[PDB]
Design an enzyme around this catalytic site. Structure first.
Site, PDB file in Angstrom:
ATOM      1  N   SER A   4       0.638  -0.915   0.147  1.00  0.00           N
ATOM      2  CA  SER A   4       0.220   0.058   0.173  1.00  0.00           C
ATOM      3  C   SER A   4       1.349   0.886   0.202  1.00  0.00           C
ATOM      4  O   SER A   4       1.758   1.139   0.741  1.00  0.00           O
ATOM      5  CB  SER A   4      -0.682  -0.079   1.395  1.00  0.00           C
ATOM      6  OG  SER A   4      -1.901  -1.189   1.138  1.00  0.00           O
ATOM      7  N   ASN A  31       1.649   4.148   4.163  1.00  0.00           N
ATOM      8  CA  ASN A  31       2.039   3.424   4.740  1.00  0.00           C
ATOM      9  C   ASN A  31       3.229   3.361   5.204  1.00  0.00           C
ATOM     10  O   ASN A  31       3.739   1.838   4.594  1.00  0.00           O
ATOM     11  CB  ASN A  31       0.553   2.108   3.921  1.00  0.00           C
ATOM     12  CG  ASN A  31       0.508   1.287   5.405  1.00  0.00           C
ATOM     13  OD1 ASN A  31       0.906   1.175   5.930  1.00  0.00           O
ATOM     14  ND2 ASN A  31      -1.072   0.941   5.131  1.00  0.00           N
ATOM     15  N   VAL A  63      -9.661   2.635  -4.230  1.00  0.00           N
ATOM     16  CA  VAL A  63     -10.019   1.236  -3.848  1.00  0.00           C
ATOM     17  C   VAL A  63     -10.821   0.589  -5.222  1.00  0.00           C
ATOM     18  O   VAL A  63     -10.531  -1.068  -5.371  1.00  0.00           O
ATOM     19  CB  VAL A  63     -11.239   1.836  -3.577  1.00  0.00           C
ATOM     20  CG1 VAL A  63     -11.914   0.490  -3.400  1.00  0.00           C
ATOM     21  CG2 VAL A  63     -11.338   1.994  -2.376  1.00  0.00           C
ATOM     22  N   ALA A  66      -9.818   1.021  -8.973  1.00  0.00           N
ATOM     23  CA  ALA A  66      -9.480   0.595  -9.733  1.00  0.00           C
ATOM     24  C   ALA A  66      -7.905  -0.371  -9.108  1.00  0.00           C
ATOM     25  O   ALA A  66      -7.466  -1.305  -9.595  1.00  0.00           O
ATOM     26  CB  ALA A  66      -7.354   1.846 -10.054  1.00  0.00           C
ATOM     27  N   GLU A  67      -7.651  -1.572  -7.724  1.00  0.00           N
ATOM     28  CA  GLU A  67      -7.333  -2.034  -7.268  1.00  0.00           C
ATOM     29  C   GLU A  67      -8.004  -2.896  -7.009  1.00  0.00           C
ATOM     30  O   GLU A  67      -7.320  -4.786  -6.967  1.00  0.00           O
ATOM     31  CB  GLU A  67      -6.502  -1.185  -5.591  1.00  0.00           C
ATOM     32  CG  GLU A  67      -7.594  -1.388  -4.158  1.00  0.00           C
ATOM     33  CD  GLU A  67      -7.224  -1.482  -3.455  1.00  0.00           C
ATOM     34  OE1 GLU A  67      -6.142  -1.452  -2.903  1.00  0.00           O
ATOM     35  OE2 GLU A  67      -8.126  -0.691  -2.411  1.00  0.00           O
ATOM     36  N   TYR A  95      -1.774  -9.648   3.049  1.00  0.00           N
ATOM     37  CA  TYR A  95      -1.599  -8.010   3.062  1.00  0.00           C
ATOM     38  C   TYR A  95      -1.915  -8.817   4.977  1.00  0.00           C
ATOM     39  O   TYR A  95      -2.703  -9.874   5.019  1.00  0.00           O
ATOM     40  CB  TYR A  95      -3.295  -7.469   3.231  1.00  0.00           C
ATOM     41  CG  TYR A  95      -3.399  -5.997   3.423  1.00  0.00           C
ATOM     42  CD1 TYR A  95      -2.244  -5.333   2.320  1.00  0.00           C
ATOM     43  CD2 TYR A  95      -3.658  -5.286   4.000  1.00  0.00           C
ATOM     44  CE1 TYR A  95      -1.762  -3.993   2.637  1.00  0.00           C
ATOM     45  CE2 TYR A  95      -3.561  -3.883   4.079  1.00  0.00           C
ATOM     46  CZ  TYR A  95      -2.899  -3.040   3.241  1.00  0.00           C
ATOM     47  OH  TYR A  95      -2.541  -1.384   4.066  1.00  0.00           O
ATOM     48  N   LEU A 119     -15.237  -5.849   3.175  1.00  0.00           N
ATOM     49  CA  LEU A 119     -15.759  -6.738   2.320  1.00  0.00           C
ATOM     50  C   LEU A 119     -15.780  -7.780   1.660  1.00  0.00           C
ATOM     51  O   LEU A 119     -16.449  -8.379   0.470  1.00  0.00           O
ATOM     52  CB  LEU A 119     -15.614  -5.658   1.048  1.00  0.00           C
ATOM     53  CG  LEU A 119     -15.962  -5.510  -0.716  1.00  0.00           C
ATOM     54  CD1 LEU A 119     -17.607  -6.242  -0.597  1.00  0.00           C
ATOM     55  CD2 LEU A 119     -15.391  -4.654  -1.021  1.00  0.00           C
TER      56      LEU A 119
HETATM   57  C1  LIG Z   1      -1.655  -0.953  -3.983  1.00  0.00           C
HETATM   58  C2  LIG Z   1      -3.003  -2.140  -4.343  1.00  0.00           C
HETATM   59  C3  LIG Z   1      -2.280  -2.487  -2.609  1.00  0.00           C
HETATM   60  C4  LIG Z   1      -3.368  -3.689  -2.083  1.00  0.00           C
HETATM   61  C5  LIG Z   1      -3.407  -3.687  -0.450  1.00  0.00           C
HETATM   62  O1  LIG Z   1      -4.134  -4.964  -0.175  1.00  0.00           O
HETATM   63  C6  LIG Z   1      -4.036  -2.736   0.350  1.00  0.00           C
HETATM   64  O2  LIG Z   1      -4.883  -2.229  -1.346  1.00  0.00           O
END
Ligand SMILES: CCCC[C@H](O)CO
Length: 230
Positions: free
Chosen positions: A32, A35, A175, A177-178, A198, A204
């Site tokens: 991310s 962060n 959000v 786009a990812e 992650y 979600l």
């Molecule tokens: C670059 C997208 C980062 C994805 C991670 O899971 C946080 O959204």
């Protein structure tokens, strides 16, 4: 080192995600932007652990819509674009170091690197459709936007900024786009199956796995939480 193999304890989103994880075919490491968790040594731990455990490793960095996070927090557009490029180059450098150290291919992409990929575009169009047409799905998407704005502001020392709706709707472009990689990362990339990994739960994703939307994860796609324990 078996300390490296055990560097993370894995918490799957679903039992299907657990099977994909235990298959060890592919891990996608989500990095991310803006962060504080993703320091050089943490990115090294992620790739060191992944290289000892999975057959294939890929790193996912933020794409262009990361500037929307900074913009929503006030940053003017060209300064935001500049700071995104610096953030992404930093992530790439740290990721490349660790992959090269493990004798791994430098398999690093941003979520903007797939605009000519049919899987990405079709999943993205589905995400946008249900963001517009399903208020329940939109609410969850805006909560993800809230999470991303809260985490950015804290890491940029801006917890003094109230988070308004228009901020949420501007940031939710990040959000949306990812999300195709959350839903179909393996099929977008070309692996039989994959887990996106992650360090925080994906609420979600819990609802998607509870069958609450027409949006579905691909059958070959999972999600894992990585925790570090003593
Ligand atoms: C670059 C997208 C980062 C994805 C991670 O899971 C946080 O959204």
């Amino acid at each position: 080192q078996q300390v490296i193999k055990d560097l993370f304890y894995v918490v799957p989103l679903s039992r299907n995600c657990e099977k994909i994880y235990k298959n060890k075919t592919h891990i996608l490491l989500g990095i991310s932007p803006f962060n504080s968790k993703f320091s050089q040594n943490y990115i090294h731990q992620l790739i060191d652990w992944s290289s000892k455990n999975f057959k294939n490793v890929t790193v996912l960095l933020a794409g262009d819509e990361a500037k929307n996070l900074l913009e929503a927090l006030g940053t003017p557009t060209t300064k935001a674009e500049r700071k995104v490029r610096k953030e992404i180059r930093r992530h790439f450098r740290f990721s490349e170091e660790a992959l090269r150290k493990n004798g791994r291919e430098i398999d690093i992409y941003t979520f903007s690197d797939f605009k000519n990929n049919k899987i990405y575009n079709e999943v993205y169009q589905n995400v946008i459709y249900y963001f517009e047409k399903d208020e329940k799905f939109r609410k969850s998407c805006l909560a993800m936007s809230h999470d991303a704005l809260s985490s950015a502001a804290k890491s940029l020392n801006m917890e003094d900024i109230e988070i308004t709706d228009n901020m949420l709707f501007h940031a939710v472009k990040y959000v949306l786009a990812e999300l195709p990689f959350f839903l179909s990362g393996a099929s977008i990339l070309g692996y039989k199956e994959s887990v996106l990994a992650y360090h925080r739960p994906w609420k979600l994703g819990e609802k998607i796995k509870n069958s609450e939307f027409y949006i579905k994860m691909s059958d070959n796609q999972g999600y894992i939480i990585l925790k570090q324990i003593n």
